[PDB]
Amino acid sequence: GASIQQQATVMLKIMQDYDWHVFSLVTTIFPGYRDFISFIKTTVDNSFVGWDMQNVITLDTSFEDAKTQVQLKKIHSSVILLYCSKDEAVLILSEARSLGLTGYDFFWIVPSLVSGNTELIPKEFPSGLISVSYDDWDYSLEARVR
C-alpha cells in the first residue's frame, strides 16, 4: 500500500483532470499534517496548472465554534481538502452542514485515513464524498500472499 504523498499526488491528478483549480486546505491536529503541507507546497510550485490555493485552515482543539467558525467562514472555494481522523470528521461535517457549506459545488476530498470501516458509515457524510483507499476488492488476499 501507498503512503500519504502518493495518495496526495493521485488526488491532485484527479483535481487536474476536472479543472477544479480553486481550493483551500483544511488540516486537523492529527499527526503527520506538516509533511502533507510541505509536500503540497512543493508539488504545486512545479506544476503546469498554476493552482489557486486559499490560506490553510488549521484546527486547534475540538472546535468551540467561537473562533474556529471565523476561519471556517472564510472558506469560499468549491474544492476543499480535509485531513482528519474519522471521529473528528463527523463533528466537522455536521458543523459545516450547519454553516451551509454543504452545497453541491462545495466538494470535499479526504485521504484513506478518514474512510474507516466499509460497514461503519456515518450519516453526516454527504452522498458524494471524495475518498481514495488502497482497498481493491477485485484482488483477494490469496493474490496478495502469492
61 binds its own copies (CB under 8 A): no
100 binds its own copies (CB under 8 A): yes
Sheet holding 130-131, edge to edge: 52-58, 22-27, 79-83, 107-110, 130-131
x-marked contacts with its own copies along 1-40 as a string, rule CB under 8 A: ----------------------------------------
Torsion angle of the four alpha carbons 86, 113, 93, 90, in this order, in degrees rounded to the nearest 10: -10
69 binds its own copies (CB under 8 A): yes
65-101 per-residue burial string, b: 16 or more CB within 10 A, e: under 16: eeebeebbeebebebbbbbbeeebbeebbebbeeeeb
70 binds its own copies (CB under 8 A): yes
Size of the site for its own copies (CB under 8 A): 9
67 binds its own copies (CB under 8 A): yes
Residues in contact with its own copies by CB under 8 A are 66-67, 69-70, 73, 76, 98-100
